[PDB]
């Protein structure tokens, strides 16, 4: 690995600089290097890792959707034949996206998840595993599509089970997991009723626990609760 010669602390420092510079590819590479040092990550370091890859893959997904839409329109009736280029370039972006997903899943499997014993760390990594299988599912069309979908579901479900046992209903990690698993149900699993039920129940159980929180914790939890409400509004 090209980051093998750099100090762990320097990689983390540079990840923070890259974030400030909106250099998310660099940020991700620095954080990959840091993970590969083999030590567990702190809370802050998990945030940096997840922010970096979310931004990289987010850009790739947005691009893939633009290209997929153009490709779909090219395959309608009355559309002029423009040759293989749109498919080829969509495939190029797709392959790059799959590569990033495989990289993140690789870090989780080797060996972040197996060393994560605290609820916060284990739920966070399992949520990430669900997310990156979900992104693979978004672009999947082959023999393995059902297995990819099931891999996302399984990771999210394990995270949910731990979160419900070990974390309060307002915990931002528990909330963010539920938000994303709800989207999985709606967009990937063709289960809009499950998506809506999950978002509603999550929101309501969080609402009832807000009274226990400080002002700062209240702000953190309510931000994510608003996202749940936003999705419910979109879906109902």
């Amino acid at each position: 690995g090209a980051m093998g010669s750099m100090e762990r602390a320097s990689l983390i420092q540079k990840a923070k600089l890259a974030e400030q510079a909106e250099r998310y590819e660099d940020m991700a590479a620095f954080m990959k290097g840091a993970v590969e040092k083999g030590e567990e990550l702190s809370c802050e370091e998990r945030n940096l890792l997840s922010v970096a890859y979310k931004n990289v893959v987010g850009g790739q997904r947005a691009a893939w959707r633009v290209l997929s839409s153009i490709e779909q329109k090219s395959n309608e009736e009355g559309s002029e034949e423009k040759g293989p280029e749109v498919r080829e370039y969509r495939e190029k972006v797709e392959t790059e996206l799959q590569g990033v997903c495989d990289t993140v899943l690789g870090l989780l499997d080797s060996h972040l998840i197996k060393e994560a014993g605290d609820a916060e760390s284990r739920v966070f990594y399992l949520k990430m595993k669900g997310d990156y299988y979900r992104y693979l599912a978004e672009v999947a069309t082959g023999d393995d599509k059902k297995r990819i979908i099931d891999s996302a579901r399984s990771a999210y479900q394990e995270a949910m089970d731990i979160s419900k046992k070990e974390m309060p209903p307002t915990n931002p990690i528990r909330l963010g997991l539920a938000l994303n698993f709800s989207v999985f149900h709606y967009e990937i699993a063709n289960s809009p009723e499950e998506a809506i039920s999950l978002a509603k129940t999550t929101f309501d159980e969080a609402m009832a626990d807000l009274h226990t929180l400080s002002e700062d914790s209240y702000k953190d939890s309510t931000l994510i609760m608003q996202l749940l409400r936003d999705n419910l509004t979109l879906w109902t």
Binding site: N180, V183, L227, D230, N231
Partner: peptide, 5 residues
């Protein structure tokens, strides 16, 4: 697209 974090 729906919100995710």
């Amino acid at each position: 697209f729906p919100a995710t974090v």
